[PDB]
């Protein structure tokens, strides 16, 4: 399972560890869906959140520096990215549509603005490459990419820390392009566990993008 | 996979996620196998200290055991704990009674037979006037505190490859109580089934204590 | 700052670092950057869910408590504990014995006396055994498994505000164990004489129990 | 408090607070057996021998960090810790990044000089950065606009962690097999670190110390 994110980023689904019952299990301590439906709508409503613990997914992301670094900010989770500094960057860079200034009154069309950002990310990405050329180690070269450069990680979390992520990320105050990915993350989350995420929406969920997709 | 420790007690595997292969690609950041190269990987992260790649392997054990093993064992806190309620549960007439060869090397003034014989008594007492108070109207969480340590308790525990092996490296040692010793041994059994590579990198390049290198699996 | 719990036990404050400035300092750095404001800002804070800038007040506290109220406690992870050792200190004659008040409020087919009376008789004929079998050459770890959970232990606690309000929450709530919840209340109280804003904004505005909004400090 | 190190060429390592010394591990440690500078001393070079850790962490330290995005990022991938940092999509940027010198290129034989190169990184940090004030008085969101800018920006954070989790922090960056930048802030921790726990310090250094820098 994939879902693409912005114009070339992506979530997508490594692996997977139990399911609905995995927290049921948990929660009696041992080894009926209304008996065990009715349970973790109880658990969740109540704030008994440790049962959730035991469910765990790995997910492979292609995203921005930006939304990386907002992103490696939830310390509950595991995380291996590629390193810059010893592996030659593709030149992947988030180009914004114009549809994301749609709201702004902007001095210049937003297409203009389109435009000026990736003349920055070309005329940056060339000095890299002129930079490593000439000899310059990549660990030094690198360091006048943009933050919109693409990068790829790793990300294992637990049901109950994933649904800190999406309270915080799955909600308009959260940056927009990071919120795409959460809406990414929702949906693989409601595939794995749909009782648990029934769930979350009805009682715990503080977010409010995902009460209207 | 359910293994016997002490004379009640248990580590049973409940799930697992990944194997020795989850770390490789892990570590790589590429979602796709070539046995010398991978096992080579994992040799080298073992040997660098590069120990992140091994989060992204996850055990789940359910573990029956006495509370003050419990209580040794839930210090680490890289992991995710769900244990019996004693305030919301009628306990078990189940505790740990040491075997007589459990006080073997040691000089006592009357004979290991009778130091069984003393636990289990008390034991015996503490839990009679604990049913006698259940019975009596008095609550749970009030009643179970005249229970020993002894008493058996049982959790579900959730941890990653890397926290397991910080976990087998100050358990699974000889200054540890010899009652976690034993179940500590069990984890690792389970563990070298799961990840064999990353188990044997492990003894070979990081392992701290002192057990594991000298009794098999 | 020492305060009196239960019986025998107490909740004491070793160390702090920092205070409610300590919070406004972090939050401001976001925005590049008063005074009356500042205080206005941490209920801001509280308000909208942003709890990371308490992250930066810590506290250590000594405390004295039963064991069974430090298991529930100890399951807070996001902490640090250090905690006296029944393997490697001959433990003291020292338990919590619940006050008749204790049931008041519950049906009980024998006198709160009574019940009171039972819970001592096991507690002495525990410790009784246990310093026989210390007396006898038996290690003290093997010795203590005879001793019931209302044993009182000691331990140091270092943990930040965010994770203070976290274990207010769910301690500081009726739903939890009485016991614990009196300790909750000594915590509540030192927290408040600390960080009287943030506390103040907590209760207003990210607080979830019940006994600290009927209970002063 | 008031410690602070000028590191690279604009950033800095500043102390801002700290809770307990090296009798806090002292203590922390004597409750487990129910108990002289002479022994204290003695005990915490017994718990670094064994690697009993936890009681160091009744040590915590607040440090106010001025660094490049792309050092900080490193950085922040330690996760006992705590930290708040500065808002690129909060606040409007300051002309501020890190500039190597040429004596950072030293070691390596490189088409065009040092001098050079230099002057290539300031020049596309100068483009990347009159673009992105550009956009902002354009109306263009500064969440948006700051996406041009270079990872060699500098940004400001405060980090509170303990003297366990710091050891752990040093063991990692205060190495050579790490990039030099990160090396040069490592090196400014440890110099707090040892100045405010010169006996847990010591006992690092030599019984735990897995680097080779210090
Ligand atoms: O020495 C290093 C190199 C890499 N990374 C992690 C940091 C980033 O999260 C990601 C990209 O690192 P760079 O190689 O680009 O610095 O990998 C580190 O923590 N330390
Ligand atoms: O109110 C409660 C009940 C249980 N537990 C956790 C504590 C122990 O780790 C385990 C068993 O607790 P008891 O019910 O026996 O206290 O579950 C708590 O933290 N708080
Ligand atoms: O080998 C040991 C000794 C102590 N402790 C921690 C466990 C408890 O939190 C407290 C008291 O332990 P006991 O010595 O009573 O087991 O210290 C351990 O985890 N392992
Ligand atoms: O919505 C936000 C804003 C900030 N930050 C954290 C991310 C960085 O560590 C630092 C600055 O982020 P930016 O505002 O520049 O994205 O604070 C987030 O995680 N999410």
Redesign the pocket.
């Known amino acids: 399972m994939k879902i693409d994110i912005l114009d070339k980023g992506f979530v997508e689904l490594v692996d997977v560890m139990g399911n609905d019952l995995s927290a049921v299990r948990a929660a009696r301590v041992s080894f009926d869906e209304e008996r065990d439906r009715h349970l973790i709508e109880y658990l969740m409503k109540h704030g008994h959140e440790t049962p959730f613990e035991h469910i765990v997914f790995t997910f492979h992301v292609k995203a921005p520096i930006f939304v990386?670094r907002q992103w490696?900010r939830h310390r509950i989770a595991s995380?291996?990215?590629?390193?810059?500094?010893?592996?030659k960057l593709s030149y992947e860079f988030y180009i914004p549509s114009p549809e994301r200034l749609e709201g702004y009154k902007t001095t210049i069309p937003p297409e203009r603005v389109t435009e000026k950002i990736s003349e920055i990310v070309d005329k940056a990405y060339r000095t890299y490459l002129e930079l490593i050329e000439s000899g310059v180690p990549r660990?030094v070269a690198?360091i006048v990419l943009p933050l919109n450069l693409y990068?790829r990680?790793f990300w294992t979390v637990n049901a109950r820390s994933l649904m800190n992520f999406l309270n915080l990320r799955a909600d308009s105050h959260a940056q927009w392009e990071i919120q795409q990915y959460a809406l990414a993350i929702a949906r693989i989350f409601k595939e794995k566990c749909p009782w648990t995420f029934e769930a979350f929406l009805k009682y715990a969920y503080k977010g409010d993008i995902l009460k209207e997709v």
């Open positions: 990386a490696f995380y291996n990215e590629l390193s810059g500094r010893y592996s660990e690198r990068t990680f």
